[PDB]
Every structure is written in C-alpha cells, then in structure tokens.
C-alpha cells in the first residue's frame, strides 16, 4: 500500500516510506573495500562496508562515491547500496511497496535506463517512477510558482516552474557542488600546514566544511576583517586530538559557489546562473520568478547564503522588482519531503510505470513516460 | 424577458443584459493552449484559458485571436468563448433570454450563417438577431443622421446613414485597425532595442499603444519636435521591471490610420475613405453628413484623433461646409450601448428571428431578414 | 360659405380660400417613395412624402411629377396630393366648402372626368367647377380684352379673349414649358463638367434656372459678349458646398422658349405662336389683341422676357400697330389670383356643378357645363 | 498619306492605321508609379509604366485610370500614354500622318479643347478630327439607320441615327459601364471570403468578369437555379495558385446594366434608356429604330446580353413592332472599325481641322467644326 | 580606387577587396581575454586574441561573441576586430579605399549609427555604405526577383524582392540561427554522456554540427530509423583523442530550424515564415516568389535542407504552383559575393555617404540615405 521514496543523492541516500515528515534512513553513499591484508582471523571481516559502518571503519577502508555529479559511475556498488538500504536499513522487500527514485535534470538517458533495469530486474518492483529532485523540492514548499536552486553534493541545477508548467528550455546545470567545495577546502587548507590527501581524511574536511563554513555578505570587507586580527579565526577538535586554526578559509571555500574561478571552472556562479535562466524565461513570468527563489540541498545550509543570494539577485535584477529568497529550515531534505508528499497524492497514483507496462516497452518507457 | 446583447468584437467581447448603461462583461477574446509539458501534477490544469484567466496566465500560454479582421477564423474556440461568456461570466442560460449579435458590414455570408447555426443548434435560443456594429454605434449617439467611423481591432468600416435610410452602396471597408497598429508598433520598436516576437509579449505592446500612443495634429511638425530634443520621450514600466524610452513611436504608429503605406496597405487613410464615401453619396445629404461624423471603437480613443480627423476633413471638404467630429467619451463601447438601447425598443421586438421561423428556413433566414 | 380654389399645376399646387390676395399653401407637386431599405428602426418612416417634406428629404427619395404637360399621369399620387393639401396643409374638410379646379385648354376629357369623379366620390364636395388657367389669369388682370400667354411647368398655351367672348378656334397649345427648360439646362450643363442625372439633383438645376437664368434682348450680341470675356459668368452656391461657373447657359436655355429646335421640338417659339393665333383671329379684334398680351405663370418670370416678347411681336406685327406686354409683378400666381377673384363673384355662384346635379348626369356633366 | 485612328477609350486604347481590319495596338490605359523604395540599384527602373509593361509589373505598381467615365481626369499621364502609343508601340511620328480621336457624346468641351491643344501643340499634327464613338461604331455596321448602344468601360451612351441625320436631342448618357460592374463584383465577392481592395488586384476581378460573367435571360429563374444546387458554380485559376468558387455572382454583377439600384444609381437600365430615347424620337422613325439596335463596346460581350436586350425591348415596345438586336462578333472594337472605314472615305478627307485653320481659330475650332 | 566589402557577421567576418570572387579574409569573430594568471614571463603575452590566434589558443582563453543575433553587444572589441581585419589581416589602411558594411533588416538604428560613427571617426574613411545582407545575397544570384532566406549565426531574416522593388512590409525576422542550433546541440548531447559547459568547448560542438549534422526529409521516418539500429550512428574524432557516438542528434538539432519549440521559441519555423511573408505580399508577385527561394548563409549548408524546404513549401503552397529552391554551392559567402559584385557597379558609385556629406548631417545620414 505505502510507497517507498529513495532520494539516491551524490552524498547522502534519504530513504523512507510515504506519508511521513522525516526520512528514517540517512547515511553517506560510499562503499569501502578493505585496504590492508587483515592478519586477524575471523570476527566477521566483510568484502565491503556501506554507510555508517563504513564511516565508523573508514580508517582501514578506501572510501569512494559511486555517484559523480549526478551520473552513477559504478553500478555494482550502486545496486549494493540499494540492496543495503532496502534490507539492512529498512528491513523491507521491494516486491511489495512501489519505489520512487529521483534524479537531476539534463541527465544522461543511460543512467535512467540502468536505474529502471536494475529496479525491475533485480528487485522486481510492482511499479516505480523517476522524478526530478528540484520539482520535488518545490513540492515540499507547498507552492507551484518559482525557480528552484537545487545544489547537492555533485550537481547544482536550476529549473524555473510556473503555475504548473515548468520551462525545460531554461534548465541550467552547474557541475559545482559540495564535493567541489570540499576539494577546494582541502587544496586551500594545505597552506596552513594540514595535508589531507587520502579519501578517508577528506571526510574530516567535509565535516569541517559542514559545521565551520559560512558565506559572507560580501567578499572584500570580510577579507579585510580576515586580514586584520584573529577575531575571525576559530579552532576545531580533530578526531586524532589535535586542533587546527582556520582563518579566511571559513568563507573563502564557500565563495566558490559564486566565483567558480577558484577551482578553475568557467561557469557563472550560482547567483548569475539563476538570473540568466530567468532572463531566458518568459517576460511575464519574471515578476513571479524573481520573488520566488526556492533553495534546497545540503549545500544551501551555510549561514548567510540566503542574504548573499538576495543581495546578488537584487544587484542583478531591476530595482523596481522585489527579490525573495525562501530559505526553509528543512531544505537539507526538501527533495525527500517533496517525494513523500507527492507519493501520497491520489492523482499521481495512476502514472507509475508498472512491470506489465514495462515488459513490451523495455527500458525505454521511462523517457516517454516521465 | 430581458435580452442579451453580445458584441463579439475582434479584440474584446462586450456582453451584458439589455436596458443598462454599461456592459458588465469585458475581456479579451483569445484562447490559450498550454505551451509546456506541465511537470507539476494536479492543481486544476485545463486544456484552455479564456479571457482574464488567459491574460493572467499568458506567460505559459500561446494566445491567439479566433476573429481576424471581422471574420471568425476558428469556430471551436469561438463557440467556446460564447459558452464561457454565457456560463462562467454571466451565469445565465441562453435558452431563456434572446441574444443579440453584432458584425461588420461587407461580411462573408458564411460567418453569419455559422453564427446563426451555432446560436440555434448548440444553445437553442428562443430568438436572436444579427445587427451591424456601426448602425448600433449610431443608435448610441441618439441621432439618426450622420456617417459612422467604426474602427475596432480588426476592421474599420464606414456607412453613411440619413434620417433612417442608410446607403448600402457607399459602405467602405478598411482592413486597417488596432491589430495592424500593434503589429506596426512591434515592427518599429525593434529599432530601439526591444524585440517582441511572441504572442504573449505582443499584449504588452498592445497596452503600451493603449496608454502611451496619440495622434498628432500634423505629422511634419511633430516629427521636427521629435527630432529635436527628448521633450517628447516618455518612459514606461514593464511587467518584468525594465523601463523603455519611446520617442517618435508615440505618434508614428497611430499615423498608419491616415497613411496606410507604413504597413504596406494601398488603402486610403481613415480620413480619405470617409470623404470618398460621402462623395459617393447623394448630393443633398452631403451637407448633413459633413457635420456629423460619429466615431466609435477603441481605436478612436487616441488623444488628438478627433482634431486631426476634423482638420483633414475640412481640408478635403469645401470651405463653406462646416465639419463636426462627434467624439463621445464612451465611444469605446458605443456599439454595445446602441445594442442595449436597441433591444429595449418595442418596435424592434417583432423582427427577431425565432426557432419556429428558423426551422423551415434553415440557416439562410438571416440574409433575408436582417 | 367660402370656396376653395386649387390650382393643381404641373410644378406647384397653389391652394387657398376665396376672397384673399395670396395663396397660403404653395409647395412642389411631387411624391417620393423611399429608395433605400432603411436599416434604422422607428422614427416615423412613411411610405410617401408630399411637398416640402419631400423637398427636405429629397436625398433618399425618388421624386417624380404626377402631372406631365398638363395631363395627370398617375392618379393615386394625385388624389394623395389632394388629400394632403386638404388635410395636412389647410386643415379643412372638402365636405363643407366648394372647391375650384383649374386646367389647361386642349385637355383630354378623361383628365377632367377623373378629376370630377375623384372630387365627387372620394371627398364628396357639395359643388365644384373646372375653369381654365389662362381665363383666370386674365381675370386677375382686371380687364376682359387681350390674349393670354400662360406658360407654367408643363404646358404653354395661348387663348385670345375679346370683350367677354373668347375665341376657342384660335387656342394654341405648346408642350414647351419650364420642365423642358430644366431638361435642356441639365443637358447643356454637362459640357461644363457637372453631371445631373437623378431626379433629386434635377431640383438643384431647377432652382439654378429659377434664380440665375434670364432671357436676352437678342441672341447674337449676347453670345458675342459671352464669347468674349467672363464679364457674364456668375457663380452659384451648391448645397454640397461646391461652386459652379455658368456662362452662356444663363441665356441659352431660356432661348428654347423662342427657338424650340434646341430640345428638338418643331413648334414655333412662344413669340410666333401668339402672332399666328392672332393672325388666325378676327381682323377687327387684332388691333385690341396686339396691345394686350397678358403673361402669366412662373416661366414668364425671367429678367428681360417682357422686352424680348415686345421686340419680337413688333418685329412680326405691322409697324403702325403698337405692341404692349403686360408684365404684372404677381404673374407667378396670376391663375390663383383670378380663381380667387372669380370665386367671390355673385353671378358665378349659380353655375357650380352640384352633387344633386351630378348624380343623374354622371361624370359627363363637366363637358356640357364648363 | 495614311491616317491614324486612336480610340482613346476608358479601359483600352485601340490605335492603328487606316484602311486595315484590326487594330494593331491594344493595351490597358493605365500608368503605374513605383510603390516601393527600390533597394536594387540599376536594371532600368523607370518613373512610370504604360500598358502591357504595367500589366506585367502591376504587383509593385499602383495602377490608375487617367480617364473616368469619358472625361480625362489627369492630363500629364494622358499625353504620356499618347506619346507611348505613338513612339514605343507604333514607332511612327505624329507630324506625318493625321490622327483621328474619338469621344463620347454629352462630353465637357474642356476635354475636347485640351485634346485639340495637346495634339496640335505637343505633337504638331498636320490635321486631326474628333468624332463620336457611337457614330463610328454605326459606320462599322455598314448601315446608316438604327440606334447605337455604345457601352465601354466608363460611359454608356445611346444616340439614334436615321438615314444620315442623327437626333442630338435624344442622346442619352449613362455613367454605368464596365468599371462600375467591376466595382460591384469586387463589393459582392467579399461575401464569399475573397477581399480585393487594391488597384492591382482589381485587374484580376476585371479578368474574372471578362471571362466568367454572363447576363441571364431573366433574373428570377436564374436565381432560383442559383439557390438550388451548385450546377451553376464554376471555379477559376488565380495567378497566385488558389481557386475560387463563384455562384450567383456570375449573373448578379452583369444585372447592374439593367438594374442600376445595385451600385446605387437611380438611372434606368440599359434596356429602358434605349426605349425612352426612341420614345423621345420622331414617331415615323421608331419603326426603323426598333428593328435596328446596334450594340458595341466590350461591355456588350457577355454571353446572353443580346437575348435579354431583345426580350426586354419587345416587352417595352408594342407587340406589332419587331425588335432586332444586331450583335456583331467584332463589336469589342467596332468604334475602331468605324474610324478606320471612315478615314479611308474620300468625302471625309476635306473636313479635317488643319494647323493653318487652327492658328487663327484657337482651340475653339473643334466645337464649330465637329 | 578599389572598395572594401566587410561582411561583419555574427559568426564569421568575410572581408576582402572588390571585384574578386572569393573573400581572402575569413575568421571567427570572437575576442579572448587570458583566463589564467600566466606564470611564465615574456614570450609576447597579449591582452586579447582575435580570430585564428584565438581559435588556436582557445584552451586558455574565454571566447565570446561581440555580436548577438545581429546587434553588436560590445563596441570596444568590435572596433578591435575591425582594426585587426584592417591591419593585421589585410595590411591596408581604411583612409584610402572605401569600406562597405552589411547588416540584417529590422535592425536597431543605434547599431547602424555606432557603425557609421566608428567608421568615420576612428578610421576616417573617405566614403562608406550600409547595405542589407539578404539584398546582397540576392545580387550574388544574378537575378532580381525572388524571396531571400538569409540565415547566419545570429539571425534569420526573409525579405521578398520583386523586379527591383523590394517589399519592406513583408520583412520577417527570426532570432533562430546557428548559435541557437549549437546551444540546442550542447543541451541534447549531455544525454549521451558528453558535457560541454564552457565557451571554448562549445566550438568543438560547433564544428561537430558543421561537419556531422544534416536535415531530414521528414522527421518521423528518420526517427523510426534512428530508433531501430545504429545504421545511422557515426563517430567523431575529438581533439583530446576520445571518440563520441551521436545518433538522432545528427538530425534532431537541425530540426529546430523548422520546429522552434525545441529551444522554446514560439516562432514558426523557417519553412512557415517564408510562406507567411509571401502570403503577406502582393497576389500577382506570389507566382514569381514561389518559384524563387534564394537561400544563403552558413546555416543553409546542411545536407538535405533544400529538399525539405522544397517539400514543406509545396505542402504549404497551392498544388498548381511550382516551388523552386535555388541552392547555390557558394551560398556560405553569398552576402560577400553580392557585396563584391555590387561595389564594382558604376551606378552604385554615386550613393556612397562621404565625410564631406557626413559632417553637417551627423550620424543620422545613414537612415535617410541607405
Ligand atoms: N550544515 C551544513 N552546512 C554546510 N554544508 C552542509 C551542511 N550539511 C551538509 N552540507 C553539505 O551538503 C552535502 C549534502 O548534499 P545533499 O543535500 O545530501 O545532496 P543530495 O540531495 O544530492 O544527496 C554534503 O556533501 C555537505 O558537504
Ligand atoms: N485608451 C486607448 N487608446 C488607444 N487605443 C485603445 C485604447 N483602448 C483600446 N484601444 C485599442 O482598441 C482596440 C479594441 O477595439 P474594440 O473597440 O474592442 O473593437 P470591437 O468593438 O470590434 O471589439 C484594442 O485592440 C486596442 O488596441
Ligand atoms: N423666378 C423665376 N425665374 C424663372 N423661372 C421660374 C421662377 N420661379 C419659377 N420659375 C419656373 O416656373 C415653374 C413653375 O410654374 P407654375 O407657374 O407653378 O406652373 P403652374 O401654374 O402650372 O403650376 C417652375 O418649374 C420654375 O422652373
Ligand atoms: N469577353 C468579355 N466579356 C465581358 N466583358 C468584357 C469582355 N472583354 C472586355 N470586357 C469589358 O469591356 C471593357 C472594355 O471596354 P472598351 O470597349 O475597351 O471601352 P472603350 O471602347 O471606351 O475603350 C473592360 O473594362 C471589360 O470589363
Ligand atoms: N558545412 C556546414 N554545415 C552546417 N552548418 C554550417 C556549415 N558551415 C558553417 N555552418 C554554420 O553557419 C554559421 C556561420 O554563419 P555565417 O554564414 O558566417 O553568418 P554571417 O554571414 O552572418 O557571418 C556557423 O555558426 C556554423 O554553425
Ligand atoms: Mg540532491
Ligand atoms: Mg468593433
Ligand atoms: Mg399653370
Ligand atoms: Mg468606348
Ligand atoms: Mg550573415
């Protein structure tokens, strides 16, 4: 009866039933093969470790993400993570409840085809559907009008949606996301005397960026304050026991979202892609899209990103237009919230692709249906 | 008991009961099909949108006019607009009150035949009548003598009417109207750096022409003032937030009414067709037609069109004759005013074509009756 | 008690009571049917228009004269004009006052019979009488001796009358009158660039001939003056506003009265028919008829017609005889003046044909009585 | 030695030498100024285009007729057409061969004066003559007795001619001709959905009337056949590629020749003007004029016009009289045939007005001579 | 003596002398600022790179087009490109030979004014002229009649031209051109696993579209062949060494020329705008415009675009009309060919705007002259 919604993101896998507020299953999407020979005999040494067990034993593992910027690079570990979150995390079978998968727009069709094939052949689900992460994150907002700024761990994409009709010709996609921010933070933290080279360590930098990084109102004056005094510096407690003192890196690595020239990308920052997509949209819907900029994803959780997004957009947009940046306090899981509120809808229950519909169509039904 | 009068114009549909001063229902006559796929599920997405709901959601629609220059191009959307203005706008049934339709002279008989067939078969009205827009606009003037300058959104026509006997052999018809003026304004506004290509945008140009365009007393001196200084330029507030600065376009696009060589037409302007029709009329009625030039329609609402019409006519007419241009302040709906004052007349109540009269006659009773 | 005198002429109907100087009712004798369909509903549109209401609304009517050259062509409109001048113009009933009708000599008996039948059957007058227009126009002169030159709109006739005994064997009749002059003026005005084809327009030419045409003392020298210079040309104010410049047409179309070869008639001019009738008269009354040439009718109102008539007659008559042309200043209505002065006479009151006399006699009493 | 005969008609200019059967030069009499700026440089763009070159390039021109209903409205283009037909069409000089011009009766003297002045001053012809179109069209018939029904493109006139003596007092002139028929066809073709507004298009309607229009034996029964079935409708191949389906318009627009109330004229049809002119003629020549009704002009080329003219005339004329309608198969150029057969006559060679005769007389010799 | 013709297009700058067949100077119109700091010292690092040097060093540059859809967005780089093509490419001075510039119709007057000001103030040319690209591309065809389908890199416009007189009221302009096709190809190539985000890469997609894209005879059957088998797929050699396998994208992105709904535009495809402009033209020139559809520009170089244009036009045009699509093998530079054949014309040598003419007129002489 109930439906499963599985937000297979690049950094986290939010999986839970339909009709509830919060996702019950949340864990990093990495698999870890044992790095060392393992002299001790017995104790249940396994070939792989998924999620929290990998996070706890990350010292002797070699963590890696199966999903790049949205595309699934490796498939065996992806279906392994799916089997894990289905059996060892939710303790349910896929043959009973329909599953709901999410993806980013401007996605290779091979990824969706392999998703459908894996879901229908290995697990044999009665029905499923492949929605868009940004559209669901807009559902969670309760409204139907406004452009969505969805930026997760691997991809940042924006799609403007009017009063039910979205604009596919203005869908912008930026490969700059949280993983690139973590890489830039690792690259700029070596200038302080802290080398993070290995994948296992990189997670420490990820947590440091998650709980110590913020976006400045403006770059120049915050640098001037960084240059003068240590009033800005703050210390962190490392798992090994040492302490580090980061200064301008607290707001320099989040600035890459607005100035991609730091990691080398030529793409316009997240504050300019939205304005360019709205300027590519229709001239009557711009008044409604300017005052509705729905943000989602874990990357939009920095303290002060909403204020800078606002300021930049009213700097780009005309003065008479008013800019509003909807910053929900549960925007980290807004995609899952939208999927769960979508799965309970009665009108949507008819457009699930079913096995009986899938047999004659093959793995190509997903493009024509979704 | 009461009778419905429905001025199914090319740009607006003025619909209301009989015996009242103002039409209660006024909205643009366009239907809009959804342009984009519509990813959001639910919320009441419809196949079409008529009138003000189309004007509000014109961003995602593709607006189009079912009526060209007076002829009804598409019939399904026309009867859809009729059903809309009957049920969702007036909340009345056509089976009870008789309806009154209007049309322009020199009209194809197929249009009137299809009008009668749709009104008698789909709605099954007890009685109806097809009058002429200019004759009704003259009724609204309270007088019976004078030529009528009726120019709406699709057609401009002139018919001289004496003390009850009109002259059908002098009925002039000009395909130049407000839609052509809007097209010319769109064509000449690209020279300033503002491209309006799509139908939805074109409505913005229509409102700009409605509330920023005027007709000059003479073209040459106003151009000389346009050439020298910006004393003439005025800014406009666009819905997107931007501002535009129009100069000579304020009086260049309304000049097409008097110089059709701008949009390419070879027809004499609205100031020469009236004089040629009066010169085609009888030699004793010219003295009464020269001093009575009743104007109507929304196109005759430009500031200064009455003065230029006067000046041009006394330039064409002999000097001893005096020219008067009746410019009523409610000439935008003068056709509807005349229809409503006509429907209350007791003598007219006998010449409605009824269903019992329509059965044996077929759809050809309208030509012999009206 | 009082008696009605009704001069039912070809161009005008002079109707009034007896014993007064001027006729109170004067209007053109034409009926006008509506030419156009008449789209406007109501306002009192009528089937016909008689007299001044037809003259005012002549633009949309098709005027026509019921009386040709003296004979009544159509009878329904004639009795309609009679009913009009009796009820809507004089506001009196024919059943009370006796009516007096006039006619031209050498008239078909059917016309007088139908006149008597209409007056006695439709209106039921107590008494009536059918006199001769020229005899009454001679009464108005106060004298009893002299030939009468009566020329109205349709017929020109001359009857010499001695000291009470008229000569019926010398009654000449010429079908050349004002209508033929108007037709000739219309035919010769097209050579200047002014086309008058329709009946309504023709009235404008009639007024132009009434107030701009004169008869020359001699044709040759006036042509020589017309040929040289524009000293003769004069302009006219048309009702439409235009102006025309007529030259030799001011005295060419009135010359038809003396040279009938212009409109094609073979009849001797009005200056030769009088001389031929006097030469057909008795040899002792010629001395009294030569010095008494009473003129009447509206056609004899041209400036200079009296002088030319004189000159022509003394050119035809012997030198020892003296020629006099009585040109009264009220000769336009001289027939009505004579009828009114005749109706007051006591001796005439006995010879009215009465209904009681009419019953047994039928419509043939008029020939034996009058 | 040879003489030029130039029938400067309202729609066509038939020009050729004398003594031959057919006119070598035939082309429409219109001049066309270039309507558009003409971006292409070179190629021989000219200020005007006359005749067939205007007909071929009528798309970018604005055609107009210098001759109205017989009067020459504009003189510069008229003398331009004369110079064209003299030099670029016949390749002859006017100084050598005498020219013969034609005109309609009841013509303004200014037109003939300007004709003579242009022919004697600009071209300096040795001699010329201004004849009448109907008299020449009667010459072409080989007989001398009979009334002529000459109806071209601008004027329809009738003049009865006996055994050498014509009757100028019975010359009727009707302004209804082929141009008015084309205008009526354009006005009544808009009821089928085909709008012809511009002058260039109007020529297409002219050809449609020339090769698809006929006159019915009677109006009522042909309408009854038009009302029932499409057995009457016929399609036409437009130059643009489209096809049209005309029904009752094939015989409705030619009916205007007999019922002028369609275009609004009050004049009696061509079947009543002839009878009224014959009834205005002499009573002994009516027997010879009834059996001789010579028709000419291009307007008399409709299939069935002869039969309807016959039927109408024997309906108007007495029964004992026999009516004959001479319908020659070359009546389209009968005026030119008569001019050419007239120019070869030896007796006519003496009455040409010569330059030596023209010097002292001025431009007024034409009225006294012709 | 010789004249310079400079086709400053949106994607390429064809510059060469007059009187020769091929343009000697051809290079992309982009400027590239150095993206990276440039650690190496010396070697001639420059602030900008224009044309082929930018194409060779595009890896470290950020290419951008100064011309949008025809309008010049940035002026400093535009005059820089002009100075480059004048000095570093042709090695000539502008002060000696007159220059000829081209532009698209329906162009903002500010662009032409700035063009004239830059050419007369910075370079001080003796004379110049601003022609239209489509008119020149028609000159290159050697004929004068036919509509031109000019579609370059930024704008597609159509102007019908008759035998020297063009029709400015039927000039259609479509903002869909090769740049939009390249953007659509980049958007649809991400579905195969190849992300092109940066401007430098986009040139690789441009070359892929130039040498691997074709237009199908019909969309449906070619999709059916694309769906079934890889018989359609073809590989490409990337500069980095990798190979790509494109399938339906070979004919899907060129279909945008006929179905603008792919990139979101509401404009009718290039096959419908031509038919709508011809239907807006005159009815006599349609027969000559249907059989003459001159194509030009680099976008019209796809294999099979001529056949599809033909088929679509005979599908829209009537059947009796014959459609011809002139597809010249040098239509990529047809505008330059026409400019060069135009500059050698003797008649055109008089209408160059000169400095002495420019002084008193200011930068506004270009509108009144060209
Ligand atoms: N409190 C926080 N502040 C800043 N960044 C955060 C915070 N929490 C998570 N993130 C970043 O957001 C990313 C998670 O993205 P997520 O929303 O899970 O993407 P997806 O929905 O595609 O799985 C992490 O990589 C982390 O770097
Ligand atoms: N205030 C105004 N000034 C100038 N033009 C106007 C104004 N209001 C309306 N119009 C023009 O008049 C047109 C409406 O014509 P309308 O009178 O409704 O025709 P119809 O009676 O046939 O419906 C509109 O297209 C608009 O361009
Ligand atoms: N002032 C005038 N000068 C010249 N002609 C006139 C004048 N007034 C009237 N007429 C002519 O006289 C005619 C009127 O004739 P009228 O005497 O009324 O005849 P009847 O007595 O038979 O009615 C008119 O047709 C008009 O043409
Ligand atoms: N075959 C035809 N059938 C009917 N009408 C025709 C035909 N040919 C020509 N006409 C009409 O006749 C007119 C030509 O008149 P025409 O005899 O040339 O007058 P004119 O002699 O004064 O030049 C044209 O306008 C055309 O409408
Ligand atoms: N062989 C080809 N096949 C398809 N498209 C081409 C080819 N060559 C060039 N193009 C396209 O044509 C465009 C060049 O347009 P061009 O004719 O130079 O415009 P302009 O004349 O305005 O400079 C390029 O952007 C390219 O995409
Ligand atoms: Mg995400
Ligand atoms: Mg209207
Ligand atoms: Mg009288
Ligand atoms: Mg003729
Ligand atoms: Mg180009």
Q: Supply the DSSP string of C74-108, one letter for each residue.
A: -SHHHHHHHHHHHHTSS---TTTS-EEEEE-SS--
Closest by Cα among C370, C336, C351, C258 to C9:
C336
Helix (H, G, I), strand (E, B) or coil at E114: helix
| Residues 6+ away with beta carbon under 8 Å from C27 | C12, C13, C50, C51, C52, C55, C85, C89
N- to C-terminal Cα distance for chain E?
22
- Per the CB < 8 A criterion, the answer to whether D16 and D27 are in contact is no
For residue C33, the distance in angstroms to the closest alpha carbon of chain D comes to 13
Helices (H), chain B: 52-56, 76-87, 109-121, 133-140, 178-189, 199-212, 219-227, 249-252, 270-280, 286-290, 305-316, 334-343, 355-361, 365-369
Is residue C73 less than 8 Å (CB to CB) from chain D? no
Distance, CA of B309 to CA of B303 (rounded, Å): 12
Which of D71, D107, D175 minimises the CB distance to C197? D175
Q: Which uninterrupted H or E stretch holds C159?
A: strand C156-161
Q: Look up tokens 């406007």; give the residue.
A: C40
Structural domains in chain C plus CATH codes: 2-30+67-130+333-369 (3.30.420.40), 31-64 (2.30.36.70), 132-177+267-328 (3.30.420.40), 178-263 (3.90.640.10)
Helices (H), E213-269: 219-227, 249-252
- Tell me which DSSP letter residue C20 carries: -
Identify which ligand lies nearest to the alpha carbon of B207: 2
Which of B43, B58, B239 minimises the CB distance to A144? B43
Q: Is the CB of C13 under 6 A from ligand 3?
A: no
Residue E127, beta-bridge partner list:
E354
With CB atoms and an 8 Å threshold, state whether D106 touches C263. no
What beta strand segments (E) does A70-145 contain?
A: 99-103, 127-132
Q: Give C-chain residues touching B171 at CB under 8 angstroms.
A: none
Distance, CA of D123 to CA of D127 (rounded, Å): 11
Closest by Cα among C91, C105, C150, C95 to C128:
C95
CA dist B225 → B218, B222, D317 (Å): 11, 5, 72
Distance, CA of C244 to CA of C209 (rounded, Å): 13
Is residue A320 less than 8 Å (CB to CB) from chain B? yes
- Per the CB < 8 A criterion, the answer to whether A246 and A212 are in contact is yes
Distance, CA of D102 to CA of D129 (rounded, Å): 8
Tally C-beta pairs within 8 A across A and E: 35
> Tokens at residue B30, please?
């366009």
b or e along E149-171 (b: 16 or more beta carbons within 10 Å of the residue's beta carbon)? bbbbbbbbbbbbbbbbbbbbbbb
Q: Is the CB of C183 under 6 A from ligand 3?
A: no
User: Which residue from B175, B299, B337 has its CB within 8 A of the most atoms of ligand 2, so it is best to mutate?
Assistant: B299
Q: Is the CB of C299 under 6 A from ligand 3?
A: yes
CA dist C216 → C156, C249, C294 (Å): 20, 11, 20
> Tokens at residue B215, please?
């007709």
Q: What is the phi/psi pair of residue C146, to 5°? A: 135, 145
Helix (H, G, I), strand (E, B) or coil at B289: helix
Closest by Cα among A108, A300, A343 to A213:
A300
Closest by Cα among B208, B114, B155 to B10:
B155
Nearest CA to ligand 3 atom 19: C152
Of ligand 2's listed atoms, the one at least distance from the Cα of B155 is 22
Q: Which residues surround ligand 6, an ion (CB under 5 A)?
A: A 9, 133, 152
Helices (H), chain E: 52-56, 76-87, 109-121, 133-140, 178-189, 199-212, 219-227, 249-252, 270-280, 286-290, 305-316, 334-343, 355-361, 365-369
How many whole angstroms from B191 Cα to the centroid of ligand 10?
19
Q: What is the phi/psi pair of residue B22, to 5°? A: -115, 145
With CB atoms and an 8 Å threshold, state whether E284 touches D41. no
Helix (H, G, I), strand (E, B) or coil at A293: strand
Distance, CA of A142 to CA of A152 (rounded, Å): 21
Alpha-carbon C45 to chain mean position: 31
> Tokens at residue A132, please?
């868009």
Q: Which uninterrupted H or E stretch holds E4?
A: strand E4-8
Q: Which uninterrupted H or E stretch holds B130?
A: strand B127-132
Distance, CA of B130 to CA of B135 (rounded, Å): 11
- Per the CB < 8 A criterion, the answer to whether A7 and A152 are in contact is no
Distance, CA of E287 to CA of D238 (rounded, Å): 10
| Residues 6+ away with beta carbon under 8 Å from C346 | none
- The packing angle between helices D270-280 and D305-316, to 10°, is 40
Q: Look up tokens 């009434």; give the residue.
A: C210
Is residue A68 less than 8 Å (CB to CB) from chain E? no
**Closest CA in chain E for residue A171:** E187
Is residue D284 less than 8 Å (CB to CB) from chain E? no
What is the pairing mode between strands A146-151 and A293-296?
parallel
Distance, CA of C209 to CA of C198 (rounded, Å): 17
Dihedral angle, C-alpha B237, B240, B244, B250, nearest 10 °: -60
b or e along C209-243 (b: 16 or more beta carbons within 10 Å of the residue's beta carbon)? beeebebbeeeeebbeebeeeeebeeeeebbbbee
Q: Give C-chain residues touching D267 at CB under 8 angstroms.
A: 197-198
- Per the CB < 8 A criterion, the answer to whether C295 and C149 are in contact is yes
Distance, CA of E213 to CA of E193 (rounded, Å): 19
Helix (H, G, I), strand (E, B) or coil at C28: strand
Q: What is the phi/psi pair of residue B296, to 5°? A: -150, 175
> Tokens at residue A143, please?
């409204």
Q: Give D-chain residues touching E350 at CB under 8 angstroms.
A: none
Question: What is the CB neighbour count within 10 angstroms for residue A123?
Answer: 16
Q: Is A343 exposed, middle or buried (CB count within 10 Å of its CB: 0-12, 13-18, 19+)? A: buried
Q: Look up tokens 């007159």; give the residue.
A: E98
Cα angle E174, E175, E181; round to 5: 115
> Tokens at residue B41, please?
């599920």
Ligand 5 is surrounded, with C-beta below 6 A, by: E 7, 9-12, 152-153, 178, 206, 209-210, 297-299, 301-302, 332, 335
Q: Supply the DSSP string of A175-205, one letter for each residue.
A: --SHHHHHHHHHHHHGGGT----SHHHHHHH
Q: What is the phi/psi pair of residue E39, to 5°? A: -65, -40
Three-state SS string over chain D comes to: CCCEEEEECCCEEEEEECCCCCCCECCECCEEEECCCCCCCCCCCCCCCECHHHHHCCCCEEEECCECCCCECCCHHHHHHHHHHHHCCCCCCCCCCCEEEEECCCCCHHHHHHHHHHHHHCCCCCEEEEEEHHHHHHHHCCCCCEEEEEECCCCEEEEEECCCCECHHHCEEECCCHHHHHHHHHHHHHHHCCCCCCHHHHHHHHHHHHHHCCCCCCHHHHHHHHHCCCCCCEEEECCCCCEEEECCHHHHCHHHHCCCCCCCCCCCCHHHHHHHHHHHCCCCCHHHHHCCEEEECHHHHCCCHHHHHHHHHHHHCCCCCCCCCCCCCCCCCHHHHHHHHHHCCCHHHHCCEEHHHHHHHHHHHHHHHC
- Per the CB < 8 A criterion, the answer to whether C248 and C223 are in contact is yes
Is residue E175 less than 8 Å (CB to CB) from chain B? yes
Distance, CA of A249 to CA of A262 (rounded, Å): 12
């Amino acid at each position: 009866t109930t439906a499963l919604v599985c937000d297979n993101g690049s950094g986290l896998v939010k999986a839970g039933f339909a009709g509830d507020d919060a996702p019950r299953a949340v864990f990093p999407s990495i698999v870890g093969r044992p790095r060392h020979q393992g002299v001790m005999v017995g104790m249940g040494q396994k070939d792989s470790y998924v999620g929290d067990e990998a996070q706890s034993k990350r010292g002797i593992l070699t963590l890696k993400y199966p999903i790049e910027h949205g595309i699934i690079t490796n498939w065996d570990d992806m279906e392994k993570i799916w089997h894990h979150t289905f059996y060892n995390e939710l303790r349910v079978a896929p043959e009973e409840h329909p599953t709901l998968l999410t993806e980013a727009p401007l996605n290779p069709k091979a990824n969706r085809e392999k998703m459908t094939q894996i879901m229908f052949e290995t697990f044999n689900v009665p029905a499923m559907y492949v929605a868009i992460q940004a559209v669901l994150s807009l559902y969670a907002s309760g409204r139907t009008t406004g452009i969505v700024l969805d930026s997760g761990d691997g991809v940042t994409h924006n799609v403007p949606i009017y009063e039910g009709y979205a604009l596919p010709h203005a869908i912008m996609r930026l490969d700059l996301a949280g993983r690139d921010l973590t890489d830039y933070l690792m690259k700029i933290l070596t200038e302080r005397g802290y080398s993070f080279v290995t994948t296992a360590e990189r997670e420490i930098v990820r947590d440091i960026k998650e709980k110590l990084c913020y976006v400045a109102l403006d770059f120049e004056n915050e640098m001037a304050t960084a240059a003068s005094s240590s009033s800005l510096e703050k210390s962190y407690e490392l798992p090994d026991g040492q302490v580090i003192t980061i200064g301008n890196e607290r707001f320099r690595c989040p600035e890459t979202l607005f100035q991609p020239s730091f990691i080398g990308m030529e793409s316009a920052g997240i504050h300019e892609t939205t304005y360019n997509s709205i300027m590519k949209c229709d001239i009557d819907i711009r008044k409604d899209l300017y005052a509705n900029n729905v943000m989602s994803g874990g990357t939009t959780m920095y303290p002060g990103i909403a204020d800078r997004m606002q300021k930049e957009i009213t700097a780009l947009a005309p003065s008479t237009m008013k800019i509003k940046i909807i910053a929900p306090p549960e925007r980290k899981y807004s995609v899952w919230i939208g999927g769960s509120i979508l799965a309970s809808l009665s009108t949507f229950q008819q457009m699930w692709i079913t096995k009986q519909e899938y047999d004659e169509a093959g793995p190509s039904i997903v493009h024509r249906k979704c």
